[PDB]
């Protein structure tokens, strides 16, 4: 009932995320993807079953990790809606296929599903069998995918069981690209190709965005979904500074971890010498904000206000380092 | 006495065109395991290494036995082979003295690995029907992902870990050398591999020197890559042979796709073939280009690989109908 009148701002970049996993029980991202699907009317046009989907998504969600403080359901779910209004933006109107839309939604949802709470580099030090599958290449990235295309196999799970077989190739094809860029290691490459698309950007008659191949139409898409899942300080300060808590909770365990063991730890994580505001600032004018006004450059003027908020949001941080 | 005959056989070890099918039957098919063993002598790894030397035997063995016997071009015999012409590749006059042992062990080692458990399809047929292994890979290098996790975890089995003694700062920059190899024998890397080579070879310093990480892999990479491609460099009886079977393989493939309903990969329908246009497009279009690119690089040393190269090319046009 409460929770009805939260997810009427699914379509708003600001949604009160972590109310919503409060009222739905902590399952957010059930609750935000089945929205989503019934608003943009995905459940008809592919043919899903409400039950198959409910299903998927509470083991999905099931698969995040409850006692990882960042890379849980809440992020993801998070994710899913922040890259559901970018694709609204008004500069992307009709540009992508329902096929493409299910492939950015679906990706944003599975993108981090089993996260440990410890980066590539830790499960490559350690020599996990999971570095040792992946040849120590985007092992997490390769994980969340294997995982969420996996758990379509499970009892009542299949939500693409009546896409044709061409379909279902285009789809995963676009899934998997997706998620192995949001691998930071990808970051530099992403964005030097979104800005070369900035420098030759080309509109259509009726003022949208005019990508004529896949390399264009999935650039666009992986940038997208990066975008989202840097969206963080871009979001209302009271949203950001919880984010910023968990992500600090998640990264100083990684410190403890590394400790215990005599690694080096990595950076960030050492709880003992810690500068969380200065690291936000940085984090700002490396990554976020490079990143940020390319993607509002493309969609000009649609993302103004999201990099208003960005800008206000990392003087706060500023003012706040000791 | 057929023991003799293997002896005076693995004496052309660092030759090209060693005649690794008469040594594939007079080892009662061990090719695998005693052409890396004599190598491993010939360039004293065991003692550099500190190998122990049943480990060696019982790893290569293991290694060997889980390439498919079945399979008519990625098996066993086509192991030795890329092992081999690595080992002869790591020993031209231009690289003299250029990569250490650790880096000549990586080399060797990743062609020995390069295809191992290897089923005789493509990774397109693996992604086509869903298989666990393409599901597991992303649809991504599929087969080479898994050549390395295999050859990786064949190490753990009873008396095998041939890198026991190994410190763990020459496992982890062995494993990333490895790694890095097998990776770039994806043919979908094969235009970046070439067109980097073709870079190097224009801004070449010289006995080529090689500075950081990236050039000296590079190299490696395509030191093997070659070594893969090396089958129509070979002399006519032995190329001829390795034409057979990669044609067999490509053929039972189409066999199984044509059962299947699914379309028909490029040279794998029987009733639709050109072998010998195949051939002469394959020289001209992937083999020759990369080894007049290797030969650039390492100038004179391929003069009669590329030699050997452009005859058997011609031979192959000769029997165009
Ligand atoms: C370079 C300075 C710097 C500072 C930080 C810490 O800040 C944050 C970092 C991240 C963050 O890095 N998330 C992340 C992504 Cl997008 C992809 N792969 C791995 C990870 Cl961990 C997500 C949210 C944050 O604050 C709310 O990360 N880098
Ligand atoms: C362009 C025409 C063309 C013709 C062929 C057939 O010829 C051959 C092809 C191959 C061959 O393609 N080998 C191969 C490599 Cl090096 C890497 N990944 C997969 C594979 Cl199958 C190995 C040996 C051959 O005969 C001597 O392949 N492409
Ligand atoms: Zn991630
Ligand atoms: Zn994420
Ligand atoms: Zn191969
Ligand atoms: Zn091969």
């Given at each position: 009932?409460?929770?009805?009148?939260?997810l009427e701002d699914v379509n708003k970049?600001?949604?009160?995320?972590?109310?919503?996993?409060?009222?739905?029980?902590?399952?957010?991202?059930?609750?935000?993807?089945?929205?989503?699907?019934?608003?943009?009317?995905?459940?008809?046009?592919?043919?899903?079953?409400?039950?198959?989907?409910?299903?998927?998504?509470?083991?999905?969600?099931?698969?995040?990790?409850?006692?990882?403080?960042?890379?849980?359901?809440?992020?993801?779910?998070?994710?899913?809606?922040?890259?559901?209004?970018?694709?609204?933006?008004?500069?992307?109107?009709?540009?992508?296929?329902?096929?493409?839309?299910?492939?950015?939604?679906?990706?944003?949802?599975?993108?981090?599903?089993?996260?440990?709470?410890?980066?590539?580099?830790?499960?490559?030090?350690?020599?996990?069998?999971?570095?040792?599958?992946?040849?120590?290449?985007?092992?997490?990235?390769?994980?969340?995918?294997?995982?969420?295309?996996?758990?379509?196999?499970?009892?009542?799970?299949?939500?693409?069981?009546?896409?044709?077989?061409?379909?279902?190739?285009?789809?995963?094809?676009?899934?998997?690209?997706?998620?192995?860029?949001?691998?930071?290691?990808?970051?530099?490459?992403?964005?030097?190709?979104?800005?070369?698309?900035?420098?030759?950007?080309?509109?259509?008659?009726?003022?949208?965005?005019?990508?004529?191949?896949?390399?264009?139409?999935?650039?666009?898409?992986?940038?997208?979904?990066?975008?989202?899942?840097?969206?963080?300080?871009?979001?209302?300060?009271?949203?950001?500074?919880?984010?910023?808590?968990?992500?600090?909770?998640?990264?100083?365990?990684?410190?403890?971890?590394?400790?215990?063991?005599?690694?080096?730890?990595?950076?960030?994580?050492?709880?003992?010498?810690?500068?969380?505001?200065?690291?936000?600032?940085?984090?700002?004018?490396?990554?976020?904000?490079?990143?940020?006004?390319?993607?509002?450059?493309?969609?000009?003027?649609?993302?103004?206000?999201?990099?208003?908020?960005?800008?206000?949001?990392?003087?706060?941080?500023?003012?706040?380092?000791?």
């Amino acid at each position: 009932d409460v929770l009805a009148k939260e997810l009427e701002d699914v379509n708003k970049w600001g949604l009160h995320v972590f109310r919503i996993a409060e009222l739905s029980g902590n399952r957010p991202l059930t609750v935000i993807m089945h929205t989503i699907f019934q608003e943009r009317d995905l459940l008809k046009t592919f043919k899903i079953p409400v039950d198959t989907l409910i299903t998927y998504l509470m083991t999905l969600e099931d698969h995040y990790h409850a006692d990882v403080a960042y890379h849980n359901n809440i992020h993801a779910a998070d994710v899913v809606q922040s890259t559901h209004v970018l694709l609204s933006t008004p500069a992307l109107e009709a540009v992508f296929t329902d096929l493409e839309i299910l492939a950015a939604i679906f990706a944003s949802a599975i993108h981090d599903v089993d996260h440990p709470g410890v980066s590539n580099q830790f499960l490559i030090n350690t020599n996990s069998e999971l570095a040792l599958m992946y040849n120590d290449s985007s092992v997490l990235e390769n994980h969340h995918l294997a995982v969420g295309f996996k758990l379509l196999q499970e009892e009542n799970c299949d939500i693409f069981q009546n896409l044709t077989k061409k379909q279902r190739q285009s789809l995963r094809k676009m899934v998997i690209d997706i998620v192995l860029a949001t691998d930071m290691s990808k970051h530099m490459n992403l964005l030097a190709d979104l800005k070369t698309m900035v420098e030759t950007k080309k509109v259509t008659s009726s003022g949208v965005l005019l990508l004529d191949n896949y390399s264009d139409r999935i650039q666009v898409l992986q940038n997208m979904v990066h975008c989202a899942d840097l969206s963080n300080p871009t979001k209302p300060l009271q949203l950001y500074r919880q984010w910023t808590d968990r992500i600090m909770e998640e990264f100083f365990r990684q410190g403890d971890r590394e400790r215990e063991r005599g690694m080096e730890i990595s950076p960030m994580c050492d709880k003992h010498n810690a500068s969380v505001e200065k690291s936000q600032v940085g984090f700002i004018d490396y990554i976020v904000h490079p990143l940020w006004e390319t993607w509002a450059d493309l969609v000009h003027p649609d993302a103004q206000d999201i990099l208003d908020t960005l800008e206000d949001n990392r003087e706060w941080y500023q003012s706040t380092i000791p």
